[PDB]
Write a protein that binds this ligand. Structure first.
Ligand code: NAG
Lengths: 48, 48, 48
């Protein structure tokens, strides 16, 4: 149980939640900050 | 991106400043001629 | 072009211009901790 629990955590790092890509560096290095704001909002809510 | 003699230059999904540092798989240039400001009519997901 | 593992973890890469297999390892981290007797006894301190 314990192991399986945190395994799902790790798999949660590859889910979009609605952004344009699950990896943060892509959003940081492809969008101007006023829209990176929106994308990072979505990702942060999901992971929280 | 700084030769602003064009009429409309709008990038979707990419911020113009951060274009100098990305290795794309491929690009497609699609060209045509249309009268009036039908640039607004041709919008992703929009109608017209 | 490149390899990975369980999560979105680029665990290797094939390098352009040399065609070699480079492993990627995370840079070290880990939370510090401070061990101290009471300030009313001494201000000495050790760090783990
Ligand atoms: C870059 O140049 C070197 C020799 O100058 C060569 O070994 C290498 O293949 C070249 N890169 C590519 C993608 O061909």
């Amino acid at each position: 149980q314990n192991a399986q629990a945190l395994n799902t955590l790790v798999k949660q790092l590859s889910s979009n939640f609605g952004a344009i890509s699950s990896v943060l560096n892509d959003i940081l290095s492809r969008l101007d900050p006023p829209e990176a704001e929106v994308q990072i909002d979505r990702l942060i809510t999901g992971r929280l | 991106y700084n030769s602003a003699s064009f009429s409309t230059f709008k990038c979707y999904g990419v911020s113009p400043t951060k274009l100098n540092d990305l290795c794309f798989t491929n690009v497609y240039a699609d060209s045509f001629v249309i009268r009036g400001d039908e640039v607004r009519q041709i919008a992703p997901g929009q109608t017209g | 072009q490149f390899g990975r593992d369980i999560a979105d973890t680029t665990d290797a890469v094939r390098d352009p211009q040399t065609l070699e297999i480079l492993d990627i390892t995370p840079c070290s981290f880990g939370g510090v901790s401070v061990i101290t007797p009471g300030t009313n006894t001494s201000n000495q301190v050790a760090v783990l």
